[PDB]
Design a protein around this ligand. Structure first.
Ligand SMILES: *CCC(=O)N(c1ccc(O[C@@H]2CC[C@@H](NC(=O)N[C@H]3CCNC3)C2)cc1)[C@@H](C)c1ccc(Cl)cc1
Length: 144
């Protein structure tokens, strides 16, 4: 359901922004894995990320749509690709915090909405068939 995925996307942005939320076991596991992916993307794509300014929520939405088109270009879905969506929204929110021309403290609420909309509509059916978040994602990524 949308509400569950919106809460995961909002919880991850609050984790990256260092603001209080507590989160479910699914959200706790996702925060750990997505942050590890995010730090690896930030190191490997440093020069690339520094060349593009994200000064509005509309710019962030357009960049997000272009990134998703390339991430899923071959029509394949897997859990690693889904974790990368959350790592990506963490990078977008860090750029918007620094660069948003009209700062708005509620912007993270709009980014997590369009991330939840993408996940539900484009990957939701695959997620349910693969166990959902509690029997699919958590089972694969929770500590050994
Ligand atoms: C230099 C590229 C560019 O100009 N981008 C851009 C920035 C980031 C970006 O990140 C995606 C998400 C992480 C990485 N994908 C993967 O690691 N995928 C794995 C997962 C399993 N299969 C492979 C790439 C892509 C492109 C622009 C559009 C951009 C700049 C700055 C910001 Cl804040 C956003 C976008």
């Amino acid at each position: 359901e949308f509400g569950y995925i919106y809460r995961l996307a909002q919880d991850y942005l609050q984790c990256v922004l260092q603001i209080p939320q507590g989160p479910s076991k699914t959200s706790r596991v996702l925060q750990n894995v997505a942050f590890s992916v995010q730090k690896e993307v930030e190191k490997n794509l440093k020069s690339c990320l520094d060349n593009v300014n994200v000064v509005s929520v509309d710019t962030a939405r357009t960049l997000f749509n272009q990134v998703m088109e390339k991430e899923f270009e071959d029509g394949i879905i897997n859990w690693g690709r889904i974790v990368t969506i959350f790592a990506f929204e963490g990078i977008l929110i860090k750029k918007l915090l620094r660069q948003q021309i009209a700062p708005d403290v509620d912007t993270y609420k709009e980014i997590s909405y369009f991330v939840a909309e993408f996940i539900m509509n484009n990957t939701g059916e695959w997620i349910r068939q693969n166990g959902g978040w509690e029997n699919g994602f958590v089972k694969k990524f929770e500590p050994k």
